[PDB]
């Protein structure tokens, strides 16, 4: 019993983390086969930040200028190119710890695990969700750029995030593994700020299902509601509008429990309007929104990874 937010075991990704250094600038890189991926702003120095001409700064870069280190091992760089906001460094050695993997671009609301890294050294791992406003509420300090977010499915690592920068509210933005930012941000120290954010309704609902599967069900009721009627209350409380697509994604959980999604929405409606009245749900006093429907299945079903 018990419900924790959990990250994926991080070993498969740990073996891929390296240190990349251009002059005074060091940050993290991801080494898969014979390629190291890293934020392109590694070719900067403390001024080139305001507005770099990446295409042009990269021109004056030599292979020997990139210092790539894996543990106590310097990797000889034999190629380099840019792909959107990432650098792609070719090295003379294929990573022997390279896992089965793929690059995916996750959707807002979806979760992944982040391996926080510094100087090529993994420091910590935690679970987070891509917020509706295309940021993540992470924990990052100087030198953490290049750290990656990922999911694991069976024995396959899906990399979905690489860290680039911290916005003024202390939330974080980055790219997928093709170098394309999530949200409207760009990799320069210009004035940018995250847009207003909303609660991930789909995940709250999922979590509510998890509560029921775990025997926590005092909140259920005998009523239902229309989708539109739910969204009218939901949006007053700054919840993402719920869509029919979301309803279908809750399909398996609704089947397992025999509670129709709209029936659960009425329970959530009542919860928002009346509060909890001192009671708790899966031990919490708030409505958790960083567990996805899939997270719930995987956990309550005891899924493991090879």
């Amino acid at each position: 019993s018990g419900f924790r937010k959990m990250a994926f075991p991080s070993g498969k990704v740990e073996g891929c983390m390296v240190q990349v250094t251009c002059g005074t600038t060091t940050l993290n890189g991801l080494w898969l086969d014979d390629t190291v991926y890293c934020p392109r702003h590694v070719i900067c120095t403390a001024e080139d930040m305001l507005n770099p001409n990446y295409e042009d700064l990269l021109i004056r870069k030599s292979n020997h200028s990139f210092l790539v280190q894996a543990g106590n091992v310097q990797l000889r760089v034999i190629g380099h190119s840019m792909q959107n906001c990432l650098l792609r460094l070719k090295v003379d050695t294929s990573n022997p710890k390279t896992p089965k993997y793929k690059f995916v671009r996750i959707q807002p609301g979806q979760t992944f695990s982040v391996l926080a890294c510094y100087n090529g050294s993994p420091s910590g791992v935690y679970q987070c969700a891509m917020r509706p406003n295309h940021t993540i509420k992470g924990s990052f300090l100087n030198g953490s750029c290049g750290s990656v977010g990922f999911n694991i499915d069976y024995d396959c690592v899906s990399f979905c995030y690489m860290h680039h920068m911290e916005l003024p509210t202390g939330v974080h933005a980055g790219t997928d593994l093709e170098g394309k930012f999530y949200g409207p941000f760009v990799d320069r120290q210009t004035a940018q700020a995250a847009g207003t954010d909303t609660t991930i309704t789909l995940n709250v609902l999922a979590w509510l299902y998890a509560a029921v599967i775990n025997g926590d069900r005092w909140f259920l009721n005998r009523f239902t509601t229309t989708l539109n009627d739910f969204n009218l209350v939901a949006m007053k409380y700054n919840y993402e509008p719920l869509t029919q697509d979301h309803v279908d994604i809750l399909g398996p959980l609704s089947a397992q429990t025999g509670i129709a999604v709209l029936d659960m929405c009425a329970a959530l409606k009542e919860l928002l309007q009346n509060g909890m009245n001192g009671r708790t749900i899966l031990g919490s006093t708030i409505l958790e929104d960083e567990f996805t429907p899939f997270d719930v299945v995987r956990q309550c079903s005891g899924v493991t990874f090879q």
Partner: peptide
């Protein structure tokens, strides 16, 4: 923004 602060590159990190």
């Amino acid at each position: 923004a602060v590159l990190x």
